[PDB]
Design a protein around this nucleic acid. Structure first.
Ligand SMILES: Nc1ncnc2c1ncn2[C@H]1C[C@H](O)[C@@H](COP(=O)(O)OP(=O)(O)OP(=O)(O)O)O1
Ligand SMILES: [Ca+2]
Ligand SMILES: [Ca+2]
Length: 421
DNA sequence: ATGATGACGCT
DNA sequence: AGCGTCAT
């Protein structure tokens, strides 16, 4: 249980653009539409590195991080679009601007948290309440959920047939008389997300997938279950079966070292197996915060808020200088810091005009033959020569010595600490 | 020769 | 403040 919290207090969605950079290039160049294609950056080394892959190309085994020359061995008719290059480096402006298109549409429906260039969390709890009162007590037609999967259902032999059967079982057992039913609330959430996804596609051309659940972690997991161009509802009730065979690494934030340590120390494989440990046990192995989080998460419960944040908190530029291209002379170091600073100035000035804010700190980070060393200085003027000069100053004293030893394999300039303006 | 980003936690 | 983790 009577006092046992069930993590069913919110409706949260995660919207994720399908193969996003590919869709941006396909909208622009119709010749690429409905074809195996990929987006690459740079071209000289092994045809360039693939950074996005259409679903038609994925069927050939083409993946992210693949060299284009290698992808071509799997998929000889693979089509390619390449990232713009400016000032000697990859320039991602086209994709950031396409991102803004989508985020602005989503923000018409609800408060969003920008999670990445192509993902946003959506807190739908309020929107759902409103739609529930407007719908009187009327049942929800399957026609309102034309691209929705209900995870765990059903419980003919074609994929769409399965989808509908599952949706039918779900709707035919919904308690539409109870405006406080979590399952009803999720369902209405899914209706709204259908509407949001239709509006994005109508107004931009871009397709996306989505997950609808009671928190961000379940929403994100949900989103990945049926892709592309589909959405998945994960109810509280679906969690025990879903987690019983769900590898721990699939849950957001457990994909790395912590997740590996959970597996090794507890000697388990699946998210569900976490339930047999006390909260104190989990905290003993993984710390107070992680332990509490795991104990609740493996039961489908998570409280991280959808933060009201549509804009990035930092604006950064970086370039790697791998192998022999590593920077070995002072003049080399200065010229690239300047290149980075010039892109940074451009993006910052745009940012200040669009969003009425100004960055106040400049963070400089380098690697010598992830980050070796980060140093910050004040950012008082949007001027690329001053920023590049300042960046040099705060890193110049780590030259072991043109000449620059040891060679620099990465330069990175990041503007941070925004104040309103 | 992945590269280019971006949020947040720890001390 | 500077570094590490985890992610797209
Ligand atoms: N490691 C990376 N380096 C550079 N760019 C990336 C990287 N990961 C993702 N991106 C860019 C390209 C993607 O189009 C976009 C969104 O990433 P992500 O959602 O992980 O894949 P995706 O949108 O291409 O495919 P999916 O349909 O699987 O989401 O961000
Ligand atoms: Ca995506
Ligand atoms: Ca994404």
């Amino acid at each position: 249980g009577p006092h046992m919290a069930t993590g069913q207090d919110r409706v949260v969605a995660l919207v994720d653009m399908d193969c996003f950079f590919v869709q941006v290039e396909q909208r622009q160049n119709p010749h690429l539409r409905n074809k195996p294609c990929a987006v690459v950056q740079y071209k000289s080394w092994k045809g360039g590195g693939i950074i996005a892959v259409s679903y038609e190309a994925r069927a050939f085994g083409v993946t992210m991080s693949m060299w284009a020359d290698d992808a071509k061995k799997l998929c000889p008719d693979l089509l390619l679009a390449q990232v713009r290059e400016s000032r000697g480096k990859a320039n991602l402006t086209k994709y950031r601007e396409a991102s803004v298109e989508v985020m602005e549409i989503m923000s018409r429906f609800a408060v969003i948290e920008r999670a990445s260039i192509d993902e946003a969390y959506v807190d739908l709890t309020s929107a759902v309440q409103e739609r529930l009162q407007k719908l009187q007590g009327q049942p929800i037609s399957a026609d309102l959920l034309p691209s929705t999967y209900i995870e765990g259902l059903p419980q003919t032999v074609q994929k769409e047939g399965m989808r509908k059967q599952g949706l039918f079982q779900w709707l035919d057992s919904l308690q539409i008389d109870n405006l406080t039913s979590p399952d009803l609330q999720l369902t209405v959430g899914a209706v709204i997300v259908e509407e949001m996804r239709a509006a994005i596609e109508r107004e931009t051309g871009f397709q996306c997938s989505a997950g609808i659940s009671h928190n961000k972690v379940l929403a994100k997991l949900a989103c990945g279950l049926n892709k592309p161009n589909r959405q998945t509802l994960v109810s509280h009730g679906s969690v025990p079966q879903l987690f019983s065979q769900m590898p721990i690494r699939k849950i957001r934030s457990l994909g790395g070292k912590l997740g590996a340590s959970v597996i090794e120390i507890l000697g388990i494989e699946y998210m569900g197996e976490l339930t047999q440990f006390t909260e104190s046990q989990l905290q003993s192995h993984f710390g107070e915060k992680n332990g509490s989080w795991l104990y609740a998460m493996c039961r489908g419960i998570e409280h991280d808020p959808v933060k009201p944040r549509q804009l990035p908190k930092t604006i950064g530029c970086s370039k790697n200088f791998p192998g022999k291209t590593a920077l070995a002379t002072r003049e080399q170091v200065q010229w690239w810091l300047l290149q980075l600073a010039q892109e940074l100035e451009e993006r910052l000035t745009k940012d200040r005009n669009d969003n009425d804010r100004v960055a106040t700190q400049l963070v400089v980070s380098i690697r010598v033959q992830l980050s070796s060393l980060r140093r910050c200085c004040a950012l008082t003027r949007y001027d690329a020569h001053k920023m590049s000069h300042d960046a040099f100053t705060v890193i110049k004293n780590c030259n072991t010595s043109t000449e620059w030893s040891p060679p620099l394999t990465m330069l990175f300039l990041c503007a941070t600490k925004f104040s309103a303006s």
